[PDB]
């Protein structure tokens, strides 16, 4: 006889996760490069516009 022991459930446990859970996340790399070139080029727009404005200010002074 064996009373008072720990035993598994009669239906068993549910299955655990032992596979690798590494899902690929992010946009495509061409999306990040296109976004990079867009952010950069808009920055160059504002920067070179400000340089020309500062040149006209230097003319006035």
């Amino acid at each position: 006889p064996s009373v008072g022991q720990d035993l598994p459930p009669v239906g068993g446990y549910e299955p655990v996760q032992w596979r690798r859970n590494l899902p690929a996340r992010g946009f495509r790399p061409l999306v990040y490069l296109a976004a990079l070139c867009g952010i950069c080029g808009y920055g160059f727009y504002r920067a070179l516009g400000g340089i020309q404005e500062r040149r006209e200010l230097k003319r006035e002074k």
């Binding site: 516009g49 400000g50 404005e53 200010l57 003319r59 006035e60 002074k61």
Partner: protein, 171 residues
């Protein structure tokens, strides 16, 4: 032309200009009034300033003593400009150069008092502020709308006066 360095000692001389040179009124305006009225003293006194520098060119190394007679007239006519701009718009001239006292005397930071002053002087002293060397299809920079370079803080008196001049319809 070169800066004083390594223990320079300032000295003044209590002495007088000689008899043969007549007396001349000197300008008492300060850097923000002078930088304010710069374009209008350059508009009224173009040929006198030109006569002075052209004389100083033609008599090389003479320099000081031989074109003194003309450097009299440039100081006199610029004193005439600043007396007239005082008596015309003391308040708005004052608004302009008190704005220029802050912001490193940058002309970029005081557009809204500058518009008031330019209107008041063109209306009454009838001198116009222009930038030469500027070929057409090139907008002058103190006329443009939405410049890239805005000041850090608009001063309060000139924003209030600019809005009141909008409401009066004089602008």
């Amino acid at each position: 032309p070169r800066e004083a360095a390594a223990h320079w000692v300032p000295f003044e001389d209590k002495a007088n200009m000689p008899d043969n040179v007549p007396d001349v009124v000197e300008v008492g305006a300060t850097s923000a009034p002078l930088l304010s009225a710069s374009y209008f003293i350059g508009a009224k006194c173009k040929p006198y300033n030109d006569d002075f520098m052209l004389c100083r060119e033609e008599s090389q190394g003479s320099g000081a003593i031989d074109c003194l007679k003309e450097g009299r007239r440039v100081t006199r006519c610029a004193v005439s400009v600043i007396e007239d701009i005082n008596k015309s718009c003391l308040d708005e001239f004052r608004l302009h150069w008190q704005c220029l006292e802050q912001n490193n005397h940058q002309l970029s930071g005081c557009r809204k008092a500058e518009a008031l002053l330019n209107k008041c002087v063109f209306t009454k002293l009838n001198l116009e502020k222009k930038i030469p060397g500027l070929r057409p299809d090139e907008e002058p920079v103190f006329l443009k709308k939405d410049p890239w370079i805005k000041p850090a803080v608009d001063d309060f008196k000139s924003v209030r006066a600019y809005a009141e001049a909008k409401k009066n319809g004089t602008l």
